[PDB]
Structures are given as structure tokens and as C-alpha cells.
Amino acid sequence: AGILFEDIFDVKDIDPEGKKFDRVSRLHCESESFKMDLILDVNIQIYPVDLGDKFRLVIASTLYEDGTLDDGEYNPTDDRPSRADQFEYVMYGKVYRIEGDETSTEAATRLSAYVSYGGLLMRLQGDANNLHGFEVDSRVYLLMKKLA
Template identity: 75%
Template structure:
């Protein structure tokens, strides 16, 4: 059992609490702030959907994302917070696969404006970086036909697994 003591207070945290903190962190696969660099660069393909190209501030990841612009309009230069996680539950416990409005407690979705649910369908490495020391990976997710590609350092994408279900959460930042 791992115990952490504070001076004069005895045992502050038990093993169960520390394990729970790890679980909460393990269900968040990626989180960063992105800036929109380009919109529909290959030409607009659908009336209510735009493909945005973004770059993250902290990890320098590239993001290609299809967004329903009728629901959530995006403009060039917008900055937003993006979180990709395996559950919407604040306590980090896995979803049961069913939504029960009466059992619904606090949700991560409450803090965001745009939420999508999808499945990781492909993860691939960049062959051109075979000689580089840092490997590059791309994770592909389909959100019911709206696609996402997150590309960058493999260390930032280690939690993505093919056929796993994920939530994408977005909230625009005011700058």
C-alpha cells in the first residue's frame, strides 16, 4: 500500500485515492490548444461541413478535422481547446455504453461547446521519418463520417488504439 503523509496530519491519501487519480488521467488521450490555419484548402466538398487544418500550441501536432459548421461555425484564426478522451465521466470510469438521463452526473461535456463520439480506425507511422530520432504517428478517427487526423510525435499518441471509441470535445477560446 502506498501512503502519502503530510506533516502533523497523519495519512493524507490512501492507495485507492492515488489509483483513482491515475485512472482519471489515463482516460484523457490528448489535450491541447489549437489555432485554425486553413479551412477547406482542397475545396469545399459538402454544404454544411468544413475541413479545418490546425496546429497545436504546446505539442506542435497537426489536426485535420471535419466540423459541422451549421452547428459549430469555425473561422480562420480561431483558437480552441481540444480534448480527446475515452469517457465523458468526470471520475474517469468507463462508459457503460448506454445513456441514462437520471443517472447522469457531472460530465466533461458540460465544459465544452462541441462534442463528437467516434472510433479510431487507423494508426500509421510516417515512413519519411524513419531516419529521424523522433517518430511521427497519425491517428485517424471517424465520427459518424466526419473524419479527423491527428499527426505528430508518437509520444503524444500512445493512448490511441485501433477500434477504440473516443470522445472529441472542443471549446473556442476568446483572445
């Protein structure tokens, strides 16, 4: 499939530290199916998000419904079936950090994957079982859709 992670999140706070940027807003959200915290930077100018909203987030390694790698190059004249068709807000970034609660001897029970979508930062932290698809310096997509 090419999907590293999928869950439904609920916006629990927007800009706790205050609005830092005008067109960008930080959402602190939590899901229900996996109990994962999410910090996400979104362009609220084009895709406004209100407190208490509920959305489906899908971290993917590729947009093509069939398992097929991406070249990281912009190809607007691409007629293949892309899973971005099923979502409203889509970003493209790279994983730049994977933290955990590991010790010198024990493995990590909880992980924390950090992604940068051209400067818009995301932190998806929760159980390490749900974050095996994430590897540092790896390109991913956001694929986020609002639901009622």
C-alpha cells in the same frame, strides 16, 4: 482522468480543397504546445468555425470525470458529472487507423491517429509521445471548446 490527449489548436485553413459538403467543413489546424497537425471535420452549421480561431481540443476515452468506462449507448437521462459540460462542441467516434514513420527495425517517432465521428473524419498527427492513448477500434470523444 480518461483523457488521451489535450492541446490548444489554431485554425490555419478551412477547406483547402474547397467546400465539399454544405453543413460540414474540414479544418486544417496546428497546435503550439506539442506541434501536432490536425485535420478535423466539423458540423459548421451548428458550431461555426472561422479561420484563425483558437480552440482547446481534448480527445478522451470517457466523459465521466472519474475513471469509468462508457457503454457506447445513448443515455440522455444521465445525471453524472460529465466533462462535456466544460466544452461547446463534442463528438463521439472511433479510432480506425494509426499510422507512423516506423521502419522494419525502428519504432515510430511520429504517429498519425485517425478517428471517425460517425463519418466526420479526424487525423491527429505528430510526435508518437502524445499519441500512446490511441488504439485502433477504440471509442473516443472530441470535447472541443473555442477560446479568445
